[model samples]
Target: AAKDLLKADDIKKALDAVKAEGSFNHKKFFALVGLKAMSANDVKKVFKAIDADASGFIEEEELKFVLKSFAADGRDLTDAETKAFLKAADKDGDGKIGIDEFETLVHEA
Candidate 1:
């Protein structure tokens, strides 16, 4: 099931949509960003690009660490918002994130 969800075609549609919409503003964005258009390996590449530490995974603390860098012109993730954002990204209830979940977050960006 998880592998099926990580197919290439789906991922491309999502990235294309992200490029087209210029934003990942809703739950629908998760589906689009999780597109199977890109191979899971490709998705992993995108995740690694954002995961500066080379940790091979994303966690709430890492988010707080990198949040500042990803921030735009004086913008930052507020404490409460960051908490909520983390919750959204940790979709599998594992307290950690994989490529698909991180893709959801990037798409949201």
Candidate 2:
């Protein structure tokens, strides 16, 4: 008989921590909110959920507000963070992050 699992509240808490601090700390945020526990399936849930336009990709514009996509009250990522995240997740160097690349980034150490 199991109970209670990951949910938006945890994401909200994690977002609060960063919102006051005024930046998105990628690795820390993921770990803090137990996102690393996600399976490939759930990671896709996040990727698709944050895609913003159902374009199967996250453009730099969407990526900038990616925090809000994950958490309603989440902080907006700065342009600097956007470029860094986009570059890292854009494995194809296509300037946008596809579902594949987003999922790949999520499951890695």
Candidate 3:
């Protein structure tokens, strides 16, 4: 038998299945979604989807409400966890995560 397939939609749907306002448990998110199993290419596809506002990088502001951005019933990331997420994913030390940095974060997790 084969293994799993990756898609940006998977990322959105998994995180979408949550309360109106749920805390951002960073580790649990990727593990629950199994995004680590996805290829970097697919991860980039997700990055594009989440990168709303057409911003080149995912700013901390968006990170706070990323789940809500994906789905109406999605959760909202708490401020502390949102900051933590940016710190963890921002490899360039630029204070935001670009496509490559986002993929690196998922893989590193």
TM-score for each model: 0.46, 0.82, 0.75
In order, what is each prediction's RMSD in angstroms? 8.5, 4.0, 5.0
lDDT tens digits by residue: candidate 1, 14-102: 44453432233335534554533455566566566546677777776665443232222213334565466578788888887777777
Pick the TM-score winner.
Answer: 2
Query: Model 1: runs farther than 4 Å from truth?
Result: 1-43, 69-76, 104-109
Flag the better candidate by lDDT, 1 or 2: 2
Q: Which 10 consecutive residues of model 3 have the lowest summed lDDT? A: 1-10
Model 2 clash number = 0
User: Which pairs, if any, clash in model 3?
Assistant: none
lDDT of 2 at 40: 73
Runs in model 3 with CA error above 4 Å? 1-22
* Candidate 2 ranges beyond 4 A from true positions: 1-5, 20-22
Clashing pairs in 2: none
Compose the digit string of candidate 3's lDDT tens values, residues 14-93: 67544434446666677656667778877676676677787889888778766654455565677777878889889889
Q: Would you list the C-alpha lDDT of every candidate in the order shown? A: 0.53, 0.71, 0.69
